A = this chain, B = another copy of it.
């Protein structure tokens, strides 16, 4: 036990299961009772880089809002949130003779909705959105106390279904100083074009247990864990044309000989990340099969190049048999 996470090294290498809050060896008969087999590394406290260790992830005492796909030590608990924008309303600043003040000529108010995907929940969201109009960033606004939405659960929005979206109209750190806009930009957008909004960063905390049996949120942050997770993991995004899922799977650096991380191919990583039931050698998700022939796979330039290099020296010419290295981005689009 070099890593000191109450898991033996042989257990962490050859497979283990958590039963009655203790680790036991893996046998083939354990799969009939609903158990799972986990493989991790014996030189690190947390394999995936998330703030929970291997034993906390495998036992399932991190939280009760984190999905069961993040119980695997090789799958990182990481929320990916975004902002959906609509209904930009313009307030005229003319004084009634008339008085067309320039510089501060109108005001803009937007309706936003925060959406979360992934596994973990964000307990205090604070997105930073910038407004783009005709290739010109008008402003960059970080959410104030009126726009901070606590306990954004995974899979649902902060303004829930059946509720009107949030309003964003202020710029100051406190709720004052409404967003101004030039007269030239006002006359430009009144003719033909619209204003788009995009997110840049989101800051949020996570819940951790205390020594008194309670959980605590304030003091933690996700901003110091994004840089660690994104550099050692590959990103797989699946679209079912009605919902979307984004997952990060840990990979092994082949050049480093001190990285005793288990090696996963594309198919095993997909099965352990998204959550699927294997039947007749075919992944099936809930009902929709996600094999290579049935669905469409979208890569990047580097991912396609790496797959092309790793496909020339394979006995079996399948995409899912290619070794998964860090930095890959995979998109899986199911047929309609």
Min CB distance A221 to B, Å, is 7
Cβ-defined partner of A147 (8 Å) among B135, B140, B224: B140
A110 to nearest B CB, angstroms? Answer: 10
The interface residues of chain A, by DSSP majority, are classed as loop
State whether the Cβ of A235 lies closer than 8 Å to any Cβ in chain B. Answer: no
Knowing A91-B103, A94-B102, A215-B224, the reply to whether A33 touches B257 (Cβ < 8 A) is yes
Residue in contact with A136 in the complex, picked from B60, B65, B89, B107, CB distance below 8 Å: B89
Q: With an 8 A cutoff between CB atoms, is A294 at the interface?
A: no
Contact A167 B137 (CB under 8 A): yes
Kindly list chain B residues whose C-beta atoms are within 8 Å of the C-beta of A213.
45-46, 53
A18 near B: Cβ within 8 Å? yes
Judge whether A224 and B207 touch: CB under 8 Å: yes
Nearest B residue to A53 via CB reads B213
Closest residue of chain B to A133 (Cβ to Cβ) is: B164
Q: Which of the residues B45, B96, B102, B140 comes within 8 Å of A96, measured between beta carbons?
A: B102
Q: CA separation between A101 and B101, bound complex, in Å?
A: 12
Asked if B227 contacts A217 (CB within 8 A), the reply is: no
Minimum C-beta distance from A242 to chain B (A): 15
Q: Which residues of B contact A102 (CB under 8 A)?
A: 91-96
The CA-CA distance from A49 to B141 in the complex, in Å, is: 36
- Which of A147, A224, A225, A230 counts the most chain B CB atoms within 10 A? A224
Contact A93 B89 (CB under 8 A): no
Task: Give A107 to B111 CA distance when docked, in angstroms.
Answer: 20
* Shortest Cβ distance from A126 into B: residue: B145
Closest to A51 in B: B214
10 interchain pairs, CB-CB under 8 A: A91-B102, A94-B102, A95-B99, A95-B102, A139-B169, A151-B224, A153-B230, A164-B198, A215-B224, A217-B224
Told that A151-B223, A207-B224 touch, could you supply 15 new A-B pairs with CB distance under 8 A? Answer: A33-B257, A51-B214, A51-B215, A60-B258, A63-B227, A64-B228, A64-B231, A89-B136, A93-B103, A111-B136, A140-B146, A173-B174, A175-B177, A207-B228, A215-B224
